[PDB]
Amino acid sequence: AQVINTNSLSLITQNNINKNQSALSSSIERLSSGLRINSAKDDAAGQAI
Amino acid sequence: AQVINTNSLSLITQNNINKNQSALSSSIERLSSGLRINSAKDDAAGQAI
Amino acid sequence: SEAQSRIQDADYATEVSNMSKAQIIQQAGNSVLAKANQVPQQVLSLLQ
């Protein structure tokens, strides 16, 4: 090893975990709920129709 | 199974049963009564004649 | 009603699969993150 002041690998791992946890939250919400729209943070045309 | 928020099969089955109930009621009422016209929700020309 | 269903339906077959994928990826990320934290530790071996 050469650098300990910044572990960029840990940073990229954190970013990947954050994206995956966003996907997981979306899935859990849509699963507990019956709907697919769910207060349309998602597409707007769908709820408008 | 894929969808639980709305069950279309049960809904159209309900519609079929509701359509059948009308014929059932008309048949039972015309059986209990002696006449076929029977306060003509049915054909009115025949009632006039 | 049948037409409106298609626009807003959970489709559990796909949602449980997405949830399982997310759980697996999160456990894998936590594993590799705990494993990556030991990388800056080998400097002490050079120190002494």
Curated annotation (Swiss-Prot), chains A, B:
Cellular compartment(s): Secreted; Bacterial flagellum
Superkingdom of origin organism: Bacteria
Cited function: Flagellin is the subunit protein which polymerizes to form the filaments of bacterial flagella.
Family according to the record: Belongs to the bacterial flagellin family.
Protein name: Flagellin
Taxonomic lineage of the native organism: Bacteria, Pseudomonadati, Pseudomonadota, Gammaproteobacteria, Enterobacterales
Encoding gene (name): fliC
Full-sequence portion shown in this chain: 2 to 50 of 548
